[PDB]
From a paper:
NlpC_A1 and NlpC_A2 consist of the C-terminal NlpC/P60 domain preceded by two bacterial SH3 domains. The NlpC/P60 domain adopts the classical papain-like fold, with a central β-sheet of 5 strands displaying an antiparallel arrangement. Hence, we concluded that NlpC_A1 and NlpC_A2 are dl-endopeptidases with specificity for the tetrapeptides in peptidoglycan and with greater activity toward monomeric muropeptides.
The structures of NlpC_A1 T. vaginalis AG_119910 (TVAG_119910) and NlpC_A2 (TVAG_457240) were determined by X-ray crystallography. A surface electrostatic calculation demonstrated that the slightly positively charged active-site groove carries two pronounced areas of strong positive charge. The first of the two areas is adjacent to the catalytic cysteine, and the second is at the base of a small pocket at the interface between the NlpC domain and the first SH3b domain bounded by the residues His195, Tyr43, Trp44, Tyr46, Phe193, and Gln184.
Numbering used by the authors: -2 to 275
Write the structure that this text describes.
């Protein structure tokens, strides 16, 4: 106020200067992703998709180095656009040199100031520009919220996110904003929480915290299923638990994003995976 800093913040930060990107994938819905700026172009690690949000770490050799949560990769720089977000502050704060409790003061910001968000989810801070002064301001000092404040954890936030897509049409290979397949809905929802998961159900099945007992399932957990009787050992489907014994999924049965009764669903579970941590 403005000097008070919580002991819960680290006294040190390795957070690198980043900007915000939105994928535009011109002319299509996807872009190949690589693990270097000089890749074996035949061996892309995966793809990223239209209207996904990323952090931009930099550019090299015609590629953008992008980040979603703990995952980073390289995509053609023409597949995304840089984003800045105008907002205002609601409480006096300092712009600090870094997102920690030992940064130097770049600029005092009075309450009600017009600012521009340049990066988000910076370990409890936004990176902003105020009157040309650039640095890190505590998240709660700004009006804009990059994710929901409501919810006890990111799992509940993920459940709300898939609920916002109820009624969207099923289309194989899509991940929003208007059409989805089962695994694209999962990846999209966690993209909006700055959490990376892979694109296909059979890989989503292999990461995240394993919830061994279904009694311990919570909103935002994903459930993978084996639904192909001609390949009965292969994971082919996925949905998100949203509480009260229901999960939401994009299904060809109805060709729509819809609720489904978990225990009445007539296909075997593979794993229950928790990709949220807070």
């Amino acid at each position: 106020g403005p000097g008070m800093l919580s002991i819960l913040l680290s006294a040190s930060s390795s957070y690198q200067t980043q900007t915000i990107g939105r994928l535009t994938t011109p002319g299509t819905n996807l872009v190949k992703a690589y693990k270097s700026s000089n890749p074996d172009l035949a061996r892309n690690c995966y793809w990223l998709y239209f209207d996904y949000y990323v952090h931009i770490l930099g550019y090299e050799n015609g590629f953008a180095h992008v980040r979603i949560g703990t995952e980073d990769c390289w995509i053609s720089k023409d597949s995304l656009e840089e984003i800045t977000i105008p907002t205002q502050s609601v409480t006096e704060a300092n712009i600090y040199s870094e997102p920690s409790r030992t940064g130097t003061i770049v600029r005092y910001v009075p309450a009600n100031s017009q600012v521009t968000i340049l990066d988000f989810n910076c370990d409890g801070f936004y990176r902003i520009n105020y009157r040309g002064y650039i640095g890190y301001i505590l998240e709660d000092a700004l009006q804009y919220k990059w994710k929901q404040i409501d919810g006890a954890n990111d799992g509940e936030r993920a459940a709300n996110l898939v609920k916002t897509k109820l009624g969207c049409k099923y289309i194989l290979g899509m991940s929003g904003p208007d059409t989805y397949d089962c695994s694209g809905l999962m990846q999209w929802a966690y993209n909006r929480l700055d959490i990376f998961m892979h694109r296909t159900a059979d890989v989503q099945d292999l990461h995240g915290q394993l919830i061994e007992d279904a009694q311990d399932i919570l909103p935002g957990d994903i459930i993978t299923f084996r639904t192909d009787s001609d390949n009965p050992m292969l994971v082919t489907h996925v949905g998100m638990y949203v509480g009260n014994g229901q999960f939401i999924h994009a299904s060809t049965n109805g060709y729509v994003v819809k609720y489904q009764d978990f225990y009445k669903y007539p296909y075997p579970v593979s794993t229950i995976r928790r990709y949220w941590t807070k």
